[PDB]
Amino acid sequence: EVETFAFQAEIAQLMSLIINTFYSNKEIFLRELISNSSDALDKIRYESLTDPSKLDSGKELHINLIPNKQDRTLTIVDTGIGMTKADLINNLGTIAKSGTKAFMEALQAGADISMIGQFGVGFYSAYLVAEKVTVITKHNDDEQYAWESSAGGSFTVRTDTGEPMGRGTKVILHLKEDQTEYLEERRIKEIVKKHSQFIGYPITLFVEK
Ligand SMILES: CCCCNC(=O)N(C)[C@@H]1C[C@@H]2C=C[C@H]1C2
């Protein structure tokens, strides 16, 4: 059972600005997704201080970067707090509405797309490099869900049947044809070292076979 939803108008507007604006410094997408993973890990770490059973679904707090040249995908996996169905469908998009409006006003004032993180909507920078984004997520209080969008104004959410995650979030970037440089080990290392060197969780860059 796949449910289809319309993005809020302001968020659809942000995604098409991200997709259509000429902007060469696309690598900042990785910093934004890693920062998102770091916050999700902070959240479950804090919550587990007052309730250790919240780590029954997995004690390890880490971030994995998994390129796959065969599928042309880059996956960012974290074992953070995860996202409920209400998060995916409504809550997070609602929060993002005000940061979207502020971000788009700043861009009129001379700001540039690399400051998207200061407005809390860094996730959508994924569409600098991806034609389609799949997010698999599991929160302790909900089931495993798959969110997906190729932009164009709509996203889908379904219950996920694949491998159980335990807890956390997996962002699968289906890369545009001319953005395969972000599948290369030396390029990913360069970006992580430049923008994410002080992230307080182990970041493991997988290599391909
Ligand atoms: C925790 C790492 C992801 C942070 N998520 C966001 O910032 N969102 C706006 C959400 C991602 C999916 C698209 C919209 C919602 C659901």
Query: Best of 42, 92, 148 to mutate for ligand 1, by most ligand atoms within 8 A of CB?
Result: 92
- Which residue's alpha carbon is at the smallest distance from atom 12 of ligand 1? 88
Solving technique:
X-ray
Taking residue 178's Cβ as centre, other Cβ atoms within 10 Å add up to 7
Is 93 a pocket residue for ligand 1 (Cβ < 6 Å)? yes
Instruction: Tell how far the Cα of 92 is from the centroid of ligand 1, in angstroms.
Output: 6
Resolution in Å, one decimal place:
2.1
- Dig out the tokens for 102 from the structure: 């502020």
> What are the two backbone dihedrals, phi and then psi, of residue 89, each rounded to the nearest 5 degrees?
-85, -40
Q: How far apart are CA 115 and CA 32, in angstroms?
A: 10
Is 88 a pocket residue for ligand 1 (Cβ < 6 Å)? yes
Task: Report the length, in residues, of the chain.
Answer: 209
Structural domains of the chain, count: 1
CB burial readout 129-154, b (16+ within 10 A) else e:
bbebbbbbbbbbeeebbbbbbbbeee
Containing domain of residue 136, as a range?
Answer: 3-205
* Residue 36 annotated as binding site: yes
- Domain of 122, CATH number, reads 3.30.565.10
> What are the two backbone dihedrals, phi and then psi, of residue 34, each rounded to the nearest 5 degrees?
-65, -40
* Residue 97 annotated as binding site: yes
Q: How far apart are CA 139 and CA 16, in angstroms?
A: 29
Q: Which residue has the tokens 């289809």?
A: 4
- Closest atom, ligand 1, to C-alpha of 80: 1
Is 145 a pocket residue for ligand 1 (Cβ < 6 Å)? no
